[PDB]
Amino acid sequence: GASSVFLFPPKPKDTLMISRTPEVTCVVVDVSAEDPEVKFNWYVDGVEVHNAKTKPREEQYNSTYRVVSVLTVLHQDWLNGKEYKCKVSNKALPSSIEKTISKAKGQPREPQVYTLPPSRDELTKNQVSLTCLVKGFYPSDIAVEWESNGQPENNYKTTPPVLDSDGSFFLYSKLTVDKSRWQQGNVFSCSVMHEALHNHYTQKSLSLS
Amino acid sequence: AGASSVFLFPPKPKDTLMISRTPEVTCVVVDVSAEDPEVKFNWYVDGVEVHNAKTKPREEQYNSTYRVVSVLTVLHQDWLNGKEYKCKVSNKALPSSIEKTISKAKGQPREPQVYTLPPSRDELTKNQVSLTCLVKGFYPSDIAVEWESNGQPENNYKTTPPVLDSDGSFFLYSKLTVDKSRWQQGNVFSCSVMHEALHNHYTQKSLSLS
Ligand SMILES: *[C@@H]1O[C@H](CO[C@@H]2O[C@@H](C)[C@@H](O)[C@@H](O)[C@@H]2O)[C@@H](O[C@@H]2O[C@H](CO)[C@@H](O[C@@H]3O[C@H](CO[C@H]4O[C@H](CO)[C@@H](O)[C@H](O)[C@@H]4O[C@@H]4O[C@H](CO)[C@@H](O[C@@H]5O[C@H](CO)[C@H](O)[C@H](O)[C@H]5O)[C@H](O)[C@H]4NC(C)=O)[C@@H](O)[C@H](O[C@H]4O[C@H](CO)[C@@H](O)[C@H](O)[C@@H]4O[C@@H]4O[C@H](CO)[C@@H](O)[C@H](O)[C@H]4NC(C)=O)[C@@H]3O)[C@H](O)[C@H]2NC(C)=O)[C@H](O)[C@H]1NC(C)=O
């Protein structure tokens, strides 16, 4: 079952902040109740490692079992482009199944962050859209958040990264707020974390002009 | 049993929304063996067999298999009214036929609101600047967005995929990049949006230096 095994990268924020602990996560589903202990082998740049913490089989709501293995990774290892391999050996199956993941290769490029106030035409509405354009970044791993008065905002959506014509990525984040909060002069801030920004962080603000 | 080797693709949104354009449904069969006899296609529209499809000759792939494509031209009205298109792929080498079906997304259509946004003040120090088109509140997600200036298509734009918003509708952004000099001259730029819930399937918003 080369499709019962899933390997997840660390969160973008986790690899960029010293206070956080990035992990790669190997998930195997559909283990039968009659199957023996599923084995995980982990490799970093081809070298086997043994510090993974594997979760005892958890019974599911569809009668199957799930096994999750978690490997903590070093911030710099991930950022320096090391390859993480997860190999899952379920003896009830013919074959072991391997997956590999790593940071995309290529010169990192610094995001340029721009905030855009609502379109004049939208000011007629009950709620208005505050836009954060983030462009020119590489690789596509990035975190974007909105806040106001030191507090996280409740209502925003961010597009996936989109490949631009010069080989870098862009995205937009759309924050929706009541027109009243906008008219009252509240300051809103889009913060962005990416490996190619100084301090891995930058913020741009937006308020009624 | 070959079931995962047949793929059925819808027409492009723009093609279904403009009568002058030709919308097509495309049935693609991959992993066709050289030892297989002729792959055969039958096509149906709401269960009724149709005969106007054009099937291309098999094309050799670098992995020693063939790809075979059949293309069915559809009426705009038919697609937009939700008729079902079925491609049935037959091959003596297989025990059973493989059938795939496709149709337009269901659910109440909602009209997009289109907003143009000028470059951020901070971007005006760059030699290239970004003109933004925000399109929101639409359903279904099938939509086309383009940019023009002086009646000519612009080259350098990219558009995000539709993103599901908190109310069940979709939004996207389209980003047009232009030389800062063209923006500063006062040239007018237009974002045009095609969607089935718009009057005449078309609307546009313009943007220039202010
Ligand atoms: C029996 O039950 C279990 C449990 O199911 C759950 O419970 C029931 C009640 C249902 O409600 C069900 O919906 C629930 O999911 C079933 O197990 C499930 O099995 C399916 C497959 O059958 C799995 O589906 C795949 O999911 C992938 C993504 O999963 C994530 O996102 C979904 C939501 O989108 C979540 O629900 C998942 O749990 C996953 O969530 C992610 O989890 C990560 C690990 O924890 C998180 O990362 C970590 O987070 C921590 C802290 O949070 C740290 O930060 C760590 O650092 C970090 O690593 C992550 O944040 C989290 N994300 C989110 C958003 O929450 C899909 O990607 C995948 O699609 C691929 O594969 C498909 C083939 O199956 C294919 O169709 C797709 O196209 C895609 O294909 C891939 O394409 C790429 C590139 O093109 C290729 O490179 C790949 O090769 C290719 N894939 C291939 C070849 O396989 C699947 O859709 C599902 O995840 C799983 N659930 C759980 C919980 O394990 C089981 O199936 C049931 N049996 C039945 C029904 O018979």
Ligand SMILES: *[C@@H]1O[C@H](CO[C@@H]2O[C@@H](C)[C@@H](O)[C@@H](O)[C@@H]2O)[C@@H](O[C@@H]2O[C@H](CO)[C@@H](O[C@@H]3O[C@H](CO[C@H]4O[C@H](CO)[C@@H](O)[C@H](O)[C@@H]4O[C@@H]4O[C@H](CO)[C@@H](O[C@@H]5O[C@H](CO)[C@H](O)[C@H](O)[C@H]5O)[C@H](O)[C@H]4NC(C)=O)[C@@H](O)[C@H](O[C@H]4O[C@H](CO)[C@@H](O)[C@H](O)[C@@H]4O[C@@H]4O[C@H](CO)[C@@H](O)[C@H](O)[C@H]4NC(C)=O)[C@@H]3O)[C@H](O)[C@H]2NC(C)=O)[C@H](O)[C@H]1NC(C)=O
């Ligand atoms: C041997 O080789 C062949 C050929 O590959 C090529 O050669 C080899 C040697 C390599 O060099 C390789 O790199 C080359 O590409 C291999 O054939 C491939 O087989 C795989 C399957 O194994 C196919 O994978 C599916 O791809 C779908 C997307 O395909 C499009 O997008 C890719 C780019 O991302 C293109 O490469 C494709 O050609 C398709 O491109 C589209 O083509 C349309 C038809 O022409 C275009 O539409 C038309 O456009 C014209 C204009 O030109 C008009 O506008 C018409 O009106 C319009 O109709 C369209 O524009 C174009 N798009 C793009 C972006 O280019 C995926 O959708 C699909 O995913 C489904 O299936 C998976 C299961 O396999 C599943 O995991 C997914 O989740 C998803 O599941 C489906 O989900 C839907 C709903 O979401 C359900 O309804 C379905 O039921 C469900 N199906 C399931 C579960 O099965 C696959 O990933 C691949 O497309 C194909 N390549 C080619 C070129 O045909 C072959 O595999 C090799 N064999 C071996 C043994 O190695």
